[PDB]
Specification:
- 2 copies of one chain form a homodimer.
- With 374 residues, chain A is α/β, with parallel strands linked by helices.
- Chain A folds into 2 domains: 1-178 and 318-374, Quinone Oxidoreductase, Chain A, domain 1; 179-317, NAD(P)-binding Rossmann-like Domain (Rossmann fold).
- In chain A, 25% of the residues lie in helices and 24% in strands.
- The two termini of chain A are 20 Å apart.
- Chain A binds chain B through residues 101-102, 105, 107-112, 117, 259-260, 272, 275, 283-286, 291-292, 294-295, 298-306, 308-318, 321, and chain B through 101-102, 105, 107-112, 117, 259-260, 272, 275, 283-286, 291-292, 294-295, 298-306, 308-318, 321.
- The complex binds a molecule of 2 linked components (NAJ-PZO) (2 copies) and zinc ion (4 copies).
- Residues 46-48, 51, 67, 93, 174-175, 178, 198-204, 222-225, 228, 243, 268-271, 274, 292-294, 318-319 of chain A line the site of a molecule of 2 linked components (NAJ-PZO).
- Chains A, B: It is an enzyme of class 1 (oxidoreductase).
- Chains A, B: Dimer of identical or non-identical chains of two types (E and S) coded by 2 separate genes at different loci.
């Protein structure tokens, strides 16, 4: 009976960088034309949400963050055709408008309506649906899932299987799809190849999953936190290396281990130095390196372009290269059919009210994904 | 007869950086096992030979440069099976040993036996076949074509059609193949696409030829020398732009002209700034940029990795990505079958004795390719 009415609910508001989230009452406006209001069920903590806190990823504050989630449609605005009240949905932090040059391209997925390249922290219409203490609060990536209710544009939501377990499939909204697609869609890992994966968090584990699914013969995990190695091996890594253990730079180590460079390398951390190291460790004539980590705002890397002239390919991608609204329902259907596993990514579960504890777990190195339940 | 004997002949020796070539008598040793001695017939002047003079491209001096050439086998060493005396041949500045990981890979062409990565300026066996005034002279890229006779390793020569016109097909030894392959093999330009080509010298014109052959709908030539535009249009450019004409950076101009970025861009100059500009002007989600120009020794570029994270692909290649010994004979057969033209690249034909005049034409902006005839 909330349709057409403002909803008062709890959200996690970030008022300032480098401070805890504030769990407090917000007002959530009803959906306008082509908007959908969603009752959240579960949301994951992705490192990119932490990047908002640390100022690594700049977006306007104050803000409701969160972008990896699943929920149930509470109401729809005028003209919505793709979801209905009561449908299970995943918000799409990369929209799929279906009309722009990228959406029409066979490969492209970074729809021109995204709010990632130059964040404004609004709905598509340039306004906000959120008020707190009487003040407007920004959106994040058109999703804002750290709230009991959010409002998203229709191009930023996908209907998923009615029988889906939302406390698992929320990871299809970011970390799993990003890493898995980086391997299977962006790099196009080949059977029998050697892969190196830098960073063994939720996204990097999902890259390993995808390299293993593509038939790689060797998958070398790289992390400075050796506590990450056991789970990386469980999901497919054949060996793991800690750069801190070596006197030589790890690109040299990896080149030696792979008898002249790897076929595919993945940067899944977000550091400029490891982006260049990961490029360098792929074979100089035919290697491919994929950047998935999010770099610190406005900072440039330095590299020798002879790394490319010999024949290397360097690319990056958002959301694993997947066209979001076409792919998310299919990934959920494949999960339901047991084509991949999400449980290896989930190390902790907490109620939404303990969001700050969830971020502490990420920052301490202890968690992969913590799932928050509303 | 000359077989088995030292040949005294004329060559252009580079004794020091930034000096004219010295045209004088050298001694050319007979070929050892698996080596081939070639009587040169024609050699082109490529900007990479000038980079040796300018110190842009470091290789041991003193040196006999030259790498884009065609000639006739004078004699073969023990064990040679792929050419015989009297055969027309093109020396291969990128070898094809057929045994290394790169040669065995379907895509790779930068054979591990190359002398480009870490130049030693010798034969494969670590010695030189050249002396001048009693001093040993270095080889260049396993070819050294600025000489009436040279000696190359068997993996660095290809037999070509006995009826081929050597004064034209010498360009298949570098400039034509490099540019054409950058388009058709490395970028894999698609029908209907928009391409931008930075640098309208012999290599860049060959990139335009490839883009046109691949069916590009728009091919935008970019050069600071407007005298290069007429020939670019003759070989397929649909429009040309001079960055000096605009108040805004050319990547902005090209993004606007292409309604949001080009499909394929090509850096065919060798400047760090234009490498980054070329990357930036390709469409951010699905654009591809290829580096063909040779960068100045030991210098790094600076770039924001968000250019890649959005979805761009950045790659480079040597020799157009062609496996050299397999491809050169087929390219010559294709030329003989009128599948592409070489005449548009040739602006000047001079006797070998005028090599310095040929370099002056290149440096002054007045030539595309000068062919030197022996
Ligand atoms: N491209 C996308 O769409 C995208 C990008 N991100 C970004 O991916 C990176 C990884 O995210 P994560 O897996 O959620 O993060 P962590 O759990 O923190 O794992 C990182 C991993 O790296 C190790 N590490 C740190 N420093 C080093 C060094 N020097 N060497 C080796 N390993 C190192 C840690 O120990 C840890 O285990 C992040 O940058 C993230 O921002 C994620 C998801 C999506 N995206 C885009 C927008 C929203 N989400
Ligand atoms: N990758 C290979 O295998 C390769 C590489 N090279 C390199 O390609 C570049 C172009 O060579 P070229 O066509 O022989 O050179 P030029 O005739 O001098 O044409 C350059 C073109 O650029 C224009 N220009 C200069 N500066 C600018 C700026 N700032 N903006 C725009 N245009 C600009 C000039 O006016 C001129 O028209 C070289 O770097 C070359 O080294 C060639 C061949 C092969 N290779 C590798 C090893 C041996 N050969
Ligand atoms: Zn779109
Ligand atoms: Zn994320
Ligand atoms: Zn080889
Ligand atoms: Zn050349």
């Amino acid at each position: 009976s909330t349709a057409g009415k403002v909803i008062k609910c709890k959200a996690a508001v970030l008022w300032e960088e480098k401070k805890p989230f504030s769990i407090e009452e917000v007002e959530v406006a009803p959906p306008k034309a082509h908007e959908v209001r969603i009752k959240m069920v579960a949301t994951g903590i992705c490192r990119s949400d932490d990047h908002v806190v640390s100022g690594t990823l700049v977006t306007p504050l104050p803000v409701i963050a969160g972008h990896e989630a699943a929920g149930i449609v509470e109401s729809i605005g005028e003209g919505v055709t793709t979801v209905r009240p009561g449908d299970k949905v995943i918000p799409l932090f990369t929209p799929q408008c279906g009309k722009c040059r990228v959406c029409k391209h066979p490969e492209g997925n970074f729809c021109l309506k995204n709010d990632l390249s130059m964040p404004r922290g609004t709905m598509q219409d340039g306004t906000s649906r959120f008020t707190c203490r009487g003040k407007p609060i920004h959106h994040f990536l058109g999703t804002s899932t750290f709230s009991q209710y959010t409002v998203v544009d229709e191009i930023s939501v996908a209907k998923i299987d009615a029988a889906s377990p939302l406390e698992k499939v929320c990871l299809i909204g970011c970390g799993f799809s990003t890493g898995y697609g980086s391997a299977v869609k962006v790099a196009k890992v080949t059977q029998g190849s050697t892969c190196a994966v830098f960073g063994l968090g939720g996204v990097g584990l999902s890259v390993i999953m995808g390299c293993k699914a593509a038939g790689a013969a060797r998958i070398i995990g790289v992390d400075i936190n050796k506590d990450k190695f056991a789970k990386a091996k469980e999901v497919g890594a054949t060996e793991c290396v800690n750069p801190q253990d070596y006197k030589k730079p790890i690109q040299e180590v990896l080149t030696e281990m792979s008898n002249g460079g790897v076929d595919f390398s993945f940067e899944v951390i977000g550091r400029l130095d490891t982006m260049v190291t990961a490029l360098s460790c792929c074979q100089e004539a035919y290697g491919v390196s994929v950047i998935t980590g999010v770099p610190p705002d406005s900072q440039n890397l330095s590299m020798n372009p002879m790394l490319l002239l010999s024949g290397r390919t360097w690319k990056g991608a958002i959301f694993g290269g997947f066209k979001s609204k076409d792919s998310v329902p299919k990934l959920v259907a494949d999960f339901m059919a047991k084509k991949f596993a999400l449980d290896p990514l989930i190390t902790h579960v907490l109620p939404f009210e303990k969001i700050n504890e969830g971020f502490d777990l990420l920052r301490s190195g202890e968690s992969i994904r913590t799932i928050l339940t509303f």
